[PDB]
Amino acid sequence: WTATSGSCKGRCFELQEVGPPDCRCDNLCKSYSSCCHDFDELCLKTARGWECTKDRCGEVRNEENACHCSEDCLSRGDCCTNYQVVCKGESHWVDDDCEEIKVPECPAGFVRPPLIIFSVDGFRASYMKKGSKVMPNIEKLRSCGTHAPYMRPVYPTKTFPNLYTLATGLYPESHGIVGNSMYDPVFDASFHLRGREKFNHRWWGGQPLWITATKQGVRAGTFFWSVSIPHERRILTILQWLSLPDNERPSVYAFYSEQPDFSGHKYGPFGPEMTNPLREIDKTVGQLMDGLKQLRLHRCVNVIFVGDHGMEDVTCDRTEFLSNYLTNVDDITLVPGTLGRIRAKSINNSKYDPKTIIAALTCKKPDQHFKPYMKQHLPKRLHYANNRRIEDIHLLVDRRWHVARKPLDVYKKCFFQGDHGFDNKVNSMQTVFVGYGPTFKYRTKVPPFENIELYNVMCDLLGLKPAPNNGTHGSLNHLLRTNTFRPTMPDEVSRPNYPGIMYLQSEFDLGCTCDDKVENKLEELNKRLHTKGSTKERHLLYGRPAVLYRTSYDILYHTDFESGYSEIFLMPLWTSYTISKQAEVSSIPEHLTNCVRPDVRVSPGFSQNCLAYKNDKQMSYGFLFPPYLSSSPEAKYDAFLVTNMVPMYPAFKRVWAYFQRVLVKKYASERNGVNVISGPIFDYNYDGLRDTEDEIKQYVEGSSIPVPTHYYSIITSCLDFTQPADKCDGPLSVSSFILPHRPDNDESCNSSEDESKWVEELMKMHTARVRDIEHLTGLDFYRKTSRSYSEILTLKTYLHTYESEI
Numbered sequence: 001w002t003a004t005s006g007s008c009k010g011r012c013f014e015l016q017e018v019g020p021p022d023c024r025c026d027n028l029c030k031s032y033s034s035c036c037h038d039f040d041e042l043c044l045k046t047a048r049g050w051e052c053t054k055d056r057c058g059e060v061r062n063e064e065n066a067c068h069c070s071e072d073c074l075s076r077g078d079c080c081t082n083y084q085v086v087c088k089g090e091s092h093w094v095d096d097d098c099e100e101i102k103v104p105e106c107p108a109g110f111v112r113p114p115l116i117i118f119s120v121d122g123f124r125a126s127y128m129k130k131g132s133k134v135m136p137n138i139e140k141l142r143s144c145g146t147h148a149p150y151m152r153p154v155y156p157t158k159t160f161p162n163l164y165t166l167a168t169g170l171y172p173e174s175h176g177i178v179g180n181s182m183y184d185p186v187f188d189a190s191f192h193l194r195g196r197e198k199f200n201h202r203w204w205g206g207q208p209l210w211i212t213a214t215k216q217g218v219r220a221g222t223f224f225w226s227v228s229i230p231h232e233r234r235i236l237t238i239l240q241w242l243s244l245p246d247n248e249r250p251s252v253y254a255f256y257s258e259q260p261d262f263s264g265h266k267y268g269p270f271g272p273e274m275t276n277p278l279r280e281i282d283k284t285v286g287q288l289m290d291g292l293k294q295l296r297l298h299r300c301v302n303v304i305f306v307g308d309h310g311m312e313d314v315t316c317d318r319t320e321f322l323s324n325y326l327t328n329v330d331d332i333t334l335v336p337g338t339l340g341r342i343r344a345k346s347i348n349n350s351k352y353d354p355k356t357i358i359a360a361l362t363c364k365k366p367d368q369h370f371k372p373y374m375k376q377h378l379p380k381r382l383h384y385a386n387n388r389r390i391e392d393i394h395l396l397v398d399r400r401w402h403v404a405r406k407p408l409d410v411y412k413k414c415f416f417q418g419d420h421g422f423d424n425k426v427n428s429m430q431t432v433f434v435g436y437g438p439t440f441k442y443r444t445k446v447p448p449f450e451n452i453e454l455y456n457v458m459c460d461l462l463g464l465k466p467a468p469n470n471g472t473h474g475s476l477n478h479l480l481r482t483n484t485f486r487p488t489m490p491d492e493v494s495r496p497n498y499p500g501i502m503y504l505q506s507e508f509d510l511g512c513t514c515d516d517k518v519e520n521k522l523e524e525l526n527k528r529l530h531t532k533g534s535t536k537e538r539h540l541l542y543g544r545p546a547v548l549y550r551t552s553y554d555i556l557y558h559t560d561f562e563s564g565y566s567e568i569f570l571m572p573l574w575t576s577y578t579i580s581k582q583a584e585v586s587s588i589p590e591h592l593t594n595c596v597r598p599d600v601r602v603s604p605g606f607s608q609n610c611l612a613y614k615n616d617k618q619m620s621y622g623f624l625f626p627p628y629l630s631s632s633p634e635a636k637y638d639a640f641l642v643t644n645m646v647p648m649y650p651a652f653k654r655v656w657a658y659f660q661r662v663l664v665k666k667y668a669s670e671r672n673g674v675n676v677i678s679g680p681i682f683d684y685n686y687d688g689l690r691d692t693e694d695e696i697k698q699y700v701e702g703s704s705i706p707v708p709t710h711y712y713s714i715i716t717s718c719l720d721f722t723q724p725a726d727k728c729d730g731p732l733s734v735s736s737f738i739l740p741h742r743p744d745n746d747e748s749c750n751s752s753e754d755e756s757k758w759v760e761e762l763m764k765m766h767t768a769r770v771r772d773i774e775h776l777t778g779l780d781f782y783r784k785t786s787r788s789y790s791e792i793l794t795l796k797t798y799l800h801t802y803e804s805e806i
């Protein structure tokens, strides 16, 4: 109930929300059907429109007008945005040459440069180039300020998940807005685009920027706007708030536009109808900047021009229907569209079985346009699993397609030509970023980055301490003129042991064998030197990784590779090796096919054993440093040490062996040498974070050998590829992956073919950031380079996407 009987007089677009049943006058009261009776009359004036004309200049103030052109308007803060242009012979902001803003030029009483976030729904990255002719204001922001060629959204690439990620620095699995439609089984409650449940506070986790600001003494404008408030009124409201007395005036503001998304859905990303929405958004930007110029704020405010996601061509006829695959289609609930999420229709049906649903949806049609996944098997770069609102069964839908449950859902519920929501690496889903103002750099292009990083920067722009979030604070310091954030590397928690030769061969009863008893002061001194670390500078190029948790581990040195061997997990946490452009690939010799050798530095008690692998009929093993890339026949023996062995399902070994035998050398050829760091990952609870020893759900049968959920590799070379990886003077280049350690290759529909036809495709899908591997391992890489730490943080957040050019 609302007592809509109170009045909005002197309360229009008030910032503090009044509690029910008292009527409201804030920019969202319309959404709640609670505005006072005179809100429209007083707060949403439209008379005479939005632009001054020559005949209005110097008028007698008529308080009924939407905006003013009277002599008094500048001091009142309510002139039409083109007032000084029409009435005082000034130029539009867009017509002024740009001039570097080296310091804030703010009016007296401004404690800090305000921040205005100008968010555009559905603004695909390629619009910046493709629509530049019809967007002069935006083009001025972009060319004069700091811009990226694109910014990567979060999955799913829908509006609320992305705007809330921009606001919090968090992945959707952590902030809780995991979709446009959600069911939360704990609350037994449903979230929909339409209606009222979405306003309930329990949906919205983390700490958004407006709360971070308010808690730390910084006043915020109200971020959300009711759809019926015209964009011109949103802009005039921000400009009026900026004219408030110092003690009342917010320092941070948001504008939101439902275009170009609204038209994009109807017309497709490049429909001829799309030119008009782009023109109109550019005109809104011009009103804002002209309005700032009038207020002498255009060289004081930092402006961010940012999108939530892009837009793809999608039509009704490109829908896959689960009723073409499932016999039981009425026993499931599907969240449909550009992703799919499946659960049981009834928690009382004891015949529902996820395994049979997954199988019925796996590789059933030759050009099948979705792929099913248990959520823990989704690419780790999506960070899309650790939330009870994410159903266990997920469908990743191909770009340009939809999935639905039955045909009747699609013609009884073609209209549309555009949609979005797909995997966040897809080029059509990318969006935009430009920052313009005293705190941003001048005419500077920065490489693409993820939207999870912007919360930290917006906190930096406002002098706020960010709440804990998923950005890597400092990784975007290269966007900023000042207010950079200069973190320290984390402290190493566990220091390594450096064991020498401590055990005799006969102490080992591991069930292993090796034909290695084919046996000199020249060469014998030389091999001892290798075991002491004499080649470590060649194979450990960026220093050893730091271990950021308490554990017991040993550094093991070899001719061709160095490793950090865990006594707790009985395998390396990491193995590091460099392959030059000229390296030679060799075979595993016949006499070494089944060779596994005890490592006389490491106790039998802290070693794997071969008997467990013989007994485990599902499990085989592979090696982290590949025998194929040994530097000599003698060095090759080191690769068969029990301390280089890891558990691998036979299906996964097809993948791993191809990577090791073929792809490492191919990368070394292409990149002028590579350094590789590989290792296991254990994430049985799919939270994106390193498991402790008591979270491991699967062991090699009979043993205490834990089974990795994933294997990673980080592949680093010189950005300037005219320099070899091991003698690089400048910036680095990296690509990495996190491959799921699965007992089948069901994920790859062409896996019956030669690995050259499917393995690299698999690896591209599971591309990763170094930072993703850090979270999953508790290791910290690149500790010893000649590079700035902020540069290294940017390197660690890089994702190699394998998409063609934007």
Ligand SMILES: *[C@@H]1O[C@H](CO)[C@@H](O[C@@H]2O[C@H](CO)[C@@H](O[C@@H]3O[C@H](CO[C@H]4O[C@H](CO)[C@@H](O)[C@H](O[C@H]5O[C@H](CO)[C@@H](O)[C@H](O)[C@@H]5O[C@H]5O[C@H](CO)[C@@H](O)[C@H](O)[C@@H]5O)[C@@H]4O)[C@@H](O)[C@H](O[C@H]4O[C@H](CO)[C@@H](O)[C@H](O)[C@@H]4O[C@H]4O[C@H](CO)[C@@H](O)[C@H](O)[C@@H]4O)[C@@H]3O)[C@H](O)[C@H]2NC(C)=O)[C@H](O)[C@H]1NC(C)=O
Residues within 6 Å of the ligand: 170, 171, 173, 174, 175, 176, 202, 203, 204, 205, 206, 383, 386, 387, 388, 468, 469, 470, 687, 688, 689, 775
């Ligand atoms: C991305 O960045 C974020 C932010 O930094 C990282 O998320 C953090 O990760 C931590 C580890 O997972 C997690 O720490 C836990 O906090 C618990 C207290 O939680 C409440 O308070 C915080 C602080 O204000 C608040 O933010 C939380 O908000 C969550 O929960 C509500 C819903 O319940 C949501 O509205 C909101 O969206 C958010 O949900 C997300 O996080 C939770 C986990 O907290 C998930 O379950 C959801 O799916 C969703 O992802 C909370 O309101 C605290 O209770 C935990 O402590 C237990 O475990 C530790 C292990 O160290 C142990 O020491 C403790 O003793 C304790 O154990 C006891 O509880 C166990 C579980 O019941 C039980 O098994 C034991 O037997 C014990 O009794 C834990 O410290 C932190 O909350 C989140 N923060 C956020 C905002 O998500 C995230 O990891 C980053 N991601 C990556 C990939 O790096």
Ligand SMILES: NS(=O)(=O)c1ccc(C(=O)N2C[C@H]3CN(C(=O)OCc4ccc(OC(F)(F)F)cc4)C[C@@H]3C2)cn1
Residues within 6 Å of the ligand: 117, 119, 121, 122, 158, 159, 160, 163, 164, 166, 167, 168, 180, 193, 209, 223, 224, 225, 226, 254, 255, 256, 261
């Ligand atoms: N395109 S879609 O996914 O189908 C879709 C979903 C939801 C809808 C839909 O009805 N909405 C009603 C709109 C009103 N909103 C609003 O005023 O947002 C202000 C805002 C908030 C946070 C921001 O980020 C920051 F904090 F700055 F970092 C920036 C701006 C956004 C809502 C989406 C429309 N389309």
Ligand SMILES: [Ca+2]
Residues within 6 Å of the ligand: 682, 683, 684, 685, 686, 687, 688, 689, 690, 691
């Ligand atoms: Ca984990």
Ligand SMILES: [Cl-]
Residues within 6 Å of the ligand: 156, 158, 178, 179, 180, 181, 335
């Ligand atoms: Cl959704």
Ligand code: NA
Residues within 6 Å of the ligand: 612, 613, 614, 615, 616, 617, 618, 619, 620
């Ligand atoms: Na076996």
Ligand code: NA
Residues within 6 Å of the ligand: 745, 746, 747, 748, 749, 750, 751, 752
């Ligand atoms: Na297959």
Ligand SMILES: [Zn+2]
Residues within 6 Å of the ligand: 122, 159, 261, 262, 265, 420
């Ligand atoms: Zn949309």
